[PDB]
Design a protein around this ligand. Sequence first.
Ligand code: NA
Length: 129
Amino acid sequence: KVFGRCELAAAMKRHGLDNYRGYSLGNWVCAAKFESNFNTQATNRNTDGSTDYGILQINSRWWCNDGRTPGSRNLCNIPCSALLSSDITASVNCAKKIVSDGNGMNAWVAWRNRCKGTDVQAWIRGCRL
Ligand code: NA
């Protein structure tokens, strides 16, 4: 599923991400835009053999099990394929764990390089929320 911008903002709000750990909704929408282009089915393979999955590009070395990342953890206790669903619940619940770790949203490369320090409220402007 490729979400619209305001559609995704509303779904993320319903699942409790607005101001989660102090990160306003626009931060989450901006991260999704630059991680996956709002596409739940996005995947990308990394040099280390891990793969990133779904709308927030959650990595198989630490967070989910894909059966092909040796020596990895599954800290979200989910198959990585669950992160590709049109239902973003599993991705949101896992993202809540990730952001609660020591580095906050700096865990997401695209957030740190493309969203942090910018007018992230623009990503929710105009939306019915
Ligand atoms: Na894993």
